[PDB]
């Protein structure tokens, strides 16, 4: 298996959303990932893995898990705190048989604390630490940014950083440890810019009235003539001016970029402008500009866009497209992810592993 | 310095947004990070750093950068492809003097390809790979999820994973290499769940009409009596039912949870329920159940919420709260971050570095 984590050995305890997304990216990058289910998947998330089944409630699955864990560099689990403990696969149990194990725990609320036993999804984890409040248009109730922010950006990504850091540390302590990845915490450091910004008046708790939430007329989407959108990211004044040029608007007849008092008149001017031609027109107007003007593409249009084609951001599998691994390494490059293959006997893996 | 990356040595080439966010987290986690500016910061994002000054244009600063890079494990650069090359800090130059260097490049569009020389921000990178399309209410044009998805979740976080993986690979090749972290790619892998789901009919390019984008009445926000919001994440039927009981609704007078045909009647019923009382009323009602119902808190209200208090998700600094490091390590724990620090003579750092 190619890529930089070639050699690393990961055990994943099948659960939902963040945990597998982390196991996946490890896989993507060359790790040898082994996922334990209950007794083919056409879920792609389960690519770059071997799947085994066991019954960790029974004496005999318990025993085979530990055999796997003992040979493994990493364990991922994403259940309620106390659950691996009571199966007897806790951190203190795994330590007895392998004290070099990086024991990664993936939760919303964390290992400890009042909420640490309650159910929740992404929307609740980001409800509590400010993030969801800030997302959306001001005249309307907050909008969920999918599960991009807590599950992944603020969950699996921080689990991955926790695992790969703890692996750096082991390479001179020679021990592992437990990583407590809680989404409420990880998403907070994800949005730390806003927290910094709030302290110098460069961000406000008021919704829809900031520089990056769509309060700013030069940082938002515009509906075009044909009902589709373009995205404007022109913060820098030189970028903004190349944008005004493509639209063919005169700086003199416009409010200045940052006269917030007149941001409504500026937006109406930009709106009228962009609605006067279809999306694709603006693509051609602004091809090779610093205008920071791009088409808003629907998922099903993505594989036709040049820049996506030329860099193989995607590959074709099953129904349609998945993302190729990221990021990319110059010397030990990742290769095309392997599809989820049918089950494997758990014994044969111990034997693969010796 | 405390935390798991204690030992690691990072040179950051000052720029905007993703690259600093990466250097920050490294810092958070114990690395010794050293940032090179042009000629005290009030910005917290610059915590866990030492700041130094050089004119990389002149033979004087070029030469001092290389001395630092030569002693360093990681270099972070966030400029246009071709820019470090022309300064004479390209990858092949650094290799001359340090072939163990992890050379991490942080861009929107990537190192290569048609758009790789154009300006952009977060909103442009997520316009192109379907992400931005999918965010928002369907009767309104896509809404930006701040810069949470391209700059951080799909930017800095994948630079971090690239750096820490390349470090693992070095620990047996004994060479480093270049990581090409592009937001367009990183965010795609971030939203891999949707890509997978599209291919089994569990996701639609139609906007605001899915399970995690606010189309589901049981995964969305609701306005309360007092104008404020709660978040409902009640996907699992047992969660959903604990939610109906908290609101005091008869399960049997409601349309089935997944009779999408009557999702408008379900939502009206829930809307009516939740508007009948203030937010904080619900916050109490649901403070323990597995109803996956939580208050939507403004950033300014976060530090008062129990779960946040007990876990020290935040600390105070500069007349306001910032996020404590994440994730958390049981044996080599991170410390409270050090604030930015005034500038330092670059020679004194060379010296400190043996």
Residue numbers in the entry:
A (entry chain B), B (entry chain A): 1 to 39, 45 to 359
From the publication, what sentences describe this entry?
α-Methylacyl-CoA racemase in M. tuberculosis (MCR) has an essential role in fatty acid metabolism and cholesterol utilization, contributing to the bacterium’s survival and persistence. It catalyses the racemization of α-methyl-branched fatty acyl-CoAs, converting the (2S)-epimer to a near racemic mixture of the (2R)- and (2S)-epimers. The enzyme enables the conversion of α-methyl-branched fatty acids derived from cholesterol metabolism into forms that can be utilized by M. tuberculosis for growth and persistence within the host, a key component of M. tuberculosis pathogenesis. Within each active site, the large domain contributes the catalytic residues H126 (part of α-helix 3) and D156 (part of α-helix 5), while the small domain contributes a third catalytic residue, E241 (part of α-helix 9).
Crystals of the three MCR mutants H126A, D156A and E241A were obtained using identical conditions to those used with the wild-type enzyme and diffracted to 2.45, 1.64 and 1.85 Å resolutions, respectively. The three mutants collectively had fewer hydrogen bond interactions; within the H126A, D156A and E241A mutants, 3, 5 and 5 interactions were observed, respectively. The active site of the H126A mutant underwent the most profound structural change due to the loss of the imidazole ring, although D156 and its hydrogen bond interactions remained unaffected. The E241 side-chain which is hydrogen-bonded to H126 within the wild-type, is rotated by around 90° and projects away from the active site due to loss of its binding partner (H126). Interestingly, the normalized temperature factor (B-value, 45.79 Å2) of this E241 side-chain is lower than expected due to the peripheral Q243 (39.70 Å2) residue hydrogen bonding to it. As the E241 residue is stabilized by Q243, it moves away from D156, and hence, it cannot substitute the central structural role of the imidazole ring of H126. Consequently, five H126-mediated hydrogen bond interactions are lost. The observed displacement of E241 also suggests that it is unlikely to substitute the catalytic function of H126, which implies that the residual enzymatic activity observed in the H126A mutant is facilitated solely by the D156 side-chain. Wild-type MCR was the most efficient enzyme with a kcat/Km of 1.07 × 106 M−1.s−1, while the H126A mutant was the least efficient at 0.11 × 106 M−1.s−1. This near 10-fold decrease in catalytic efficiency for the H126A mutant relative to wild-type MCR contrasts with the near abolition of activity previously observed, but shows that although all three mutants had diminished activity, the H126A mutation was most detrimental.
